Subunit: 513 residues, 4 copies
Amino acid sequence: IQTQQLHAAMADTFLEHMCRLDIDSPPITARNTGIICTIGPASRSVETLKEMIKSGMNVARLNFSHGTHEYHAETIKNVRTATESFASDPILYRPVAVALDTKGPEIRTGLAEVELKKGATLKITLDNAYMEKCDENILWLDYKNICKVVEVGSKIYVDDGLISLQVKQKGADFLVTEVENGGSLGSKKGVNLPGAAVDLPAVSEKDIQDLKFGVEQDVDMVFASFIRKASDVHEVRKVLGEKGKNIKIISKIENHEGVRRFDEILEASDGIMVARGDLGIEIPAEKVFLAQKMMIGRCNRAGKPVICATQMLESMIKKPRPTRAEGSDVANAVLDGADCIMLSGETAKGDYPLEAVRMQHLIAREAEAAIYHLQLFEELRRLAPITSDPTEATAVGAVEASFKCCSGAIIVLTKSGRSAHQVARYRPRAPIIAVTRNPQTARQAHLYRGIFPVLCKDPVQEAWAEDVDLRVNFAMNVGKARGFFKKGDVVIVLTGWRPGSGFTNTMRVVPVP
Amino acid sequence: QTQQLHAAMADTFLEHMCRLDIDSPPITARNTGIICTIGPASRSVETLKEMIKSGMNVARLNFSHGTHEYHAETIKNVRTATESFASDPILYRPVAVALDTKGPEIRTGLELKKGATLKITLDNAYMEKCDENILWLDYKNICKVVEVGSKIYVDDGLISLQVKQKGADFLVTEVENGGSLGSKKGVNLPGAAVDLPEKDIQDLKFGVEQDVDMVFASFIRKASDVHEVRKVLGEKGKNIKIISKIENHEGVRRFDEILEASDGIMVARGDLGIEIPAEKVFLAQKMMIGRCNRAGKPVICATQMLESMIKKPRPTRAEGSDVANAVLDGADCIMLSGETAKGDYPLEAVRMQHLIAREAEAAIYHLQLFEELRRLAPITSDPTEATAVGAVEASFKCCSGAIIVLTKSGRSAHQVARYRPRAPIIAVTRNPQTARQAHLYRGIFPVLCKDPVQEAWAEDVDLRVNFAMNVGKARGFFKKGDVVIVLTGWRPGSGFTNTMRVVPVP
Amino acid sequence: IQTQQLHAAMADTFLEHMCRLDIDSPPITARNTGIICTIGPASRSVETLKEMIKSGMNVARLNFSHGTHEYHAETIKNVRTATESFASDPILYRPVAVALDTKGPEIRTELKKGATLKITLDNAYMEKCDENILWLDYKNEVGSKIYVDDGLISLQVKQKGADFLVTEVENGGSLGSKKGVNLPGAAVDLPAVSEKDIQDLKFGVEQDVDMVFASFIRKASDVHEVRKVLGEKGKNIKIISKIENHEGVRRFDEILEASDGIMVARGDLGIEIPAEKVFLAQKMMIGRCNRAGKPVICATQMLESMIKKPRPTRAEGSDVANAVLDGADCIMLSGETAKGDYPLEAVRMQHLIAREAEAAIYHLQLFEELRRLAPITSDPTEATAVGAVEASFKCCSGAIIVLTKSGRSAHQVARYRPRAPIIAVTRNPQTARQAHLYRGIFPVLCKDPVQEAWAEDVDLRVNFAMNVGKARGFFKKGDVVIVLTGWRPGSGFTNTMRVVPVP
Amino acid sequence: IQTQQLHAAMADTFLEHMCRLDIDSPPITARNTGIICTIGPASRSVETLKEMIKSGMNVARLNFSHGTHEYHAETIKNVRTATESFASDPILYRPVAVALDTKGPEIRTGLTAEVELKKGATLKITLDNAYMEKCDENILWLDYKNICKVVEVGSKIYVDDGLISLQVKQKGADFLVTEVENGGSLGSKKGVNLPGAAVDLPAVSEKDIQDLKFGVEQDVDMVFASFIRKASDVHEVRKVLGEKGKNIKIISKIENHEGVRRFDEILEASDGIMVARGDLGIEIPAEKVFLAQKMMIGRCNRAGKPVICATQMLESMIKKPRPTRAEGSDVANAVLDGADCIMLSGETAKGDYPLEAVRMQHLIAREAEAAIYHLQLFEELRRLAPITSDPTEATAVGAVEASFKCCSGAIIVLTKSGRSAHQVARYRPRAPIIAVTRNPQTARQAHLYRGIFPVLCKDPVQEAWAEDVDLRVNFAMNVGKARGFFKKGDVVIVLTGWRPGSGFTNTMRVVPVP
């Protein structure tokens, strides 16, 4: 009788590992995969926000594809008010990050009781007087090259690609179309074209204002939409500038060009997010799993943070319990190597936002136990490149020792998070407690898998040896109070020699006070 | 750059994943069986006719919404639609018939609130008088099997009631999750070993007269249920294949004997989801697929794969993921209970399953799977077992278009299917039940040669190998210059499949 | 699981496989490694040779470094007369092949440390060689070194120059005339095939030599010269290149593609390269040869003590086993058979060590490694063979029975290194002799008249293979064996795999 | 990247690793495989011994098979003298161990010089002392009185170290009648091997008790026990050594089929194992001796205990100045097999070329340690390892992993009893383990384990342990610089503790050599 799927863990074959997965092997307390929850009408309440942190929300995503600067700021203040509430106890405190999502290049319909019928004609008018008053046969789109670059025999998608069309005319400002799949047209719904790469700006003027607002707001990360090359990301960084240099950029991949130029995009970006709801419209849907598994895998081999994002638990927008396809996907995502798992409408405009976060908390914890670490660690090391970096050797050594003694933690003193980040790329079962005094680092650290960031508001003792131990004691107390580990249990502590970032070379396997 | 062959040769699984291309086009053949559930949405032959082109290989019939005389019109429709293509034996596609029992079930009497207290009684009159004041059940042994602190679930698990007080025929329970209360709702008791073990005998005995290929058993908890179900099928139903559905904690606990007794296992996720903590369902599915895979016994993943396709023409991305992951996990067949029983968009759903599955089959890391499968496979003196493992080894060496197998009971083809070959397994038989039952096994492409028995066995055998060669070329599995594997016998009859021949396609 | 190290085979790690090796897990009666025994004064005896074949000899190597054609021809007459001695029953008849080892570009000639050494290129002293009188075949840098008599006696040559260089001996050794002198410093640029070698190779063709052992091969250019000189009358003669220098190790990839097989000629290689690095050069060449599927021979000092000693040293036993473990197709006996006092005992030891080692191979890793490295192929024959080898493991085959005309089909099974004996049935006598070069292939000569019906002729050779396996002790009735065949007679058509019960 | 067989290391297959081996990839200066050299007339001199230590001797074996207690004491004195001639610089001093190889029990046939055994002849190896001085083809004689008790009908008997074989076809009481199986020339005082046997004779003979007790009185560091067949024999060797010899290490020699099939119990009861091949090849089939060595070296590598390869490795070198090709192969494959220590016997004791041969053991072993496939070996040791709560065991595996990641020039460990270093050695790194001790016995005993380079800090203690830890780590850095092991700007793994005593050993530091 045992825990953490340990019988499977020591299975010599992956097939045997699955045969030994036990629904009667209760999981460890700590959850490694990060939960990102989009905030909006359902969750913007500090009452909901306080309870979302309680239910395991680690990051708050703001979608500028919708809304205004005033709306989001009210939410960002509201999220920050909720987080400071649990700060009376620093040990029980959880830092919560704020992320910004760009509208990006989008084609949107004009301003609902019109249903498009199969066998009907629709003309995509480009007279801009239908922007507020759009008829069924007269449709205005916020794009100028649809008719120009989409010719007869093409197809168009509106409202999450739920209303399909077929093109029978090409020209200037007009498009005669058939409705292949019909339905109730909605106001200002997204237009998607599978057969073209939009010519619209990857970073528009609204995007420049939206990114600028975040630098004024102290956002820890940003989610760049419709990124098709590294050129797109660099434009985003220059807009963030010197005051946002430390703001992490996560590029959202939702297009064929990005999937092709993905390797260039990853080296450029600070992380990747698989935007499935958009990526599925552009490429055939039955090919999307390959893209998620391809990107999560490449991101893991480069130690760059990857997020799984859309329609994970969608039924929960209207339902209190999730479908089995949904439950399987959230776990398969953690099983695939996703650092963070996200919720969109489920949390933003949902009947059950808290219920969704809790499900993502449970299914994730169970999957982390199910991972074949022995194979995974073998491959990440086998595919690791030999370096003379001290921190890199110490980090791989700490994870190997965590596996050997079955540690209840890996404790890292990190000022920029980079030390703890390298331990995470090696994918330990041991929970990583990054002890930091840089608060933004504590929030941005949530992007990586396994890192439970802890903020030491305790002052500098003026003796590095005393100050370092003071911090190590803070981590020991947190893992005990949260029940991650117990006194007398072994832990790994990573530290350096000189004060300052980049001096990490010290590995300590120690029992807990 | 086809069939994810880049990922296929990767030395590590992580590298293999990195090499997954949205632009690596798959092969024409789909190996994972698609089991449709048939009902009010598609009893019609016109719709059933389109499905066979769409990809459906098995038409399931649900007893839970049926009478013993209700489904016969669908059975004729499936058969007549299937028999339409019989003119070309090469293009003909066999279709199996599956009977799913109503099984041990519980149902409410014929509006609800949250955070409340509700009592449940056995005033049998509440059967025609369902009430907000109290709910009623067809289960009389709830008091015997229920425990205080147990949770009672209603409306497919949306509603939860924790037990507080009992009584003589009543239990006082607290509502944690409220909702809309209707009538005859199924009740899943996750803290119970159901007392119900005659009506069920009738259902299985009637199954034999309908010439059904397989039986899916609802609510199996031990081998004794499986050991009993076969007897109900009888000598008349000696070949009817049983898939023992697991939708309870006990079935998961003693799974091996249930599998050993049965000819297949079904992962019944929707009921299993209520019966077990739902976060732990995938742990159960992956355990079942792996063990069923290791025992060479067919497995099916079933509930909620593309649920949104019932009311929408578009599958959710997570729905797309679950279908693909099941095939990657190793599931032989996939199911659409809701999308086809009362569903508004069935024709596309088949193709979506047909398309996701076809994409995932190439994404499978065959190198690790075959080596682990072979190493775990025991040492055998069975001549067929060696001939099978080799044809799979040969197929990997030549990236085969297909493996052509001559079988009478299907056992020869099923053995190659155990070794999970990428190549389609074209299985040639003159027994139609054999071809219908072969859909249970992943990869086998069942073909029925209706050609007359040639007096010369050697000529007769070549005719089936040529018929199958002909079927693949027409279907698009192989072409001139492709390489195929051919499995035959040395003598007529079953149990002599000792011949593998590697034939350059001309 | 108590036999053939079957408990070690089921190991998931090489280390546990080593931990599971048992001195009580006995082997099959089949030996998979070719035994090449150099013929000469102690082996030419017909009675001695007829005992060597029974003991386990498969190939007879003639050294043309020494000897006259007349002597060698009497040895081939004797070897052949001694091979057909077992021909009374074709079922028990073991084909024996004859090899020609070329003299090659060689430089040949009471000493004390620092003693006088004044070299003479005066050919009048070809008859006369003394303590300071000598001659070297070569007629073509300061601070370099020279080695003589197998590099056992060494010289430091500070004084080198226009013609002869006089330098102090770096050691001392017992000496005999006509001895090896080697120069690690320079690429030879010397004829791999001399005029003598051309005369010897032609004698081989007239003598029907199955394999030729090419000497001092440094480049593919050298391998082609031997091939073309053998000619169309000798196109089907196998050419094995012997690597005894650094250029060959450097240019091995180029030589291997040209050569049908390779010999790791260790003795000259140890003088040429630092000797401690010789094992690396062997595990290198044997491994690439297995990856290429071409025959490899480990050749020198494997049981050197047995020239004077009835039993081998522990290191000698380990080297033979380690060669077979490394993946070597053939093991070589040199003086142990040619001028030894125990020719028969050595062959008996080599057969025994080889048998135990083949049982001690970790096939699970080797087969998986061979396939993964091996390319995907259109050839149905290669596809049939990988299937037949996996089939042999699952069914623990008594043997793999393959009908071949040229050996190609049987060679194709051997590259995958199966545990079961390969019984290759051919009506071609040279192919049967040349099939020894490949691991696992037990050549058998069908002496039965070609049947008018092909189906019968196929099943005659298939039945003959069954009869040989039962008599040799390889398999018994009740055993299941793998049989490879083709859809038609002739070369290039092997695509049939039948798992039939032994009759 | 073109050195230390680094290309062949990167292969994802063992066959690729073999295919990628390069004779143009020079090895590291470091040799991790211990060299055990038998000391006899050829090397017993202090001058020869200093030359042996320079050439690579790490351990000196004294054979109680022959020689007087006084003779061996003089060689132990000379060995100690030669070793201490290098105490002039502590950095350049190499610690040298003293090994005692027991004679154990031996059975001999002794008496006109030679005779020949016709196949199937009548031979009586009887216990009558009437034929004690007159051995013949018809009658031979054996010393051990109860051989007749320890052998029974059908028992095989071997003579002259394996040359002649016999079967006890007729039973005899205080008598034995055998039929010759294989023939040859018979001499006198020849040794007898009992292949399938029921031996009851003590592995520790009364003389052996004398030699072991003499050794405890001599400050020997290891004992190579002979003819061990069971753990009782290992336990008896321990009981003789006592609490004064508790620190003395027992290396149980396996030279019988009973040792091979009872190896697991002997290894558990032992500090180490030596594969005594020559004696074993006589008893069991010679062709099966490799199966013995590979199983024992691995089960030993699995156990974290020291294993030794011993007989006829460079035998030709006793007479000739260069080894045979087979002989170089045997030494190499023993390091590739995973052996901690390689040995020289007659080659270093009575042979003409003692220093030629000790140099060849160093050169071949260095080439092989580079030719090891560490990615596979570490992964197997990690998979087969038993999960522990011991932080030192974890730190050792973590340091070995980090050493692989940084391609360090050394793993530095401070240890009093030696275990801390022994554990990094168990995980088999490519990097040299420079082990720092202040205990002279620990430094000497450490040579038994692959990778451990013992350094004896003679430098005095400092008031703070932290400063004393800093000094001992600074000592290793200096030895590595002098030896050529590393250079400033190279990365080295340093292993220490948090407080005193060396049991905890939990602090791994990755530091550049300064």
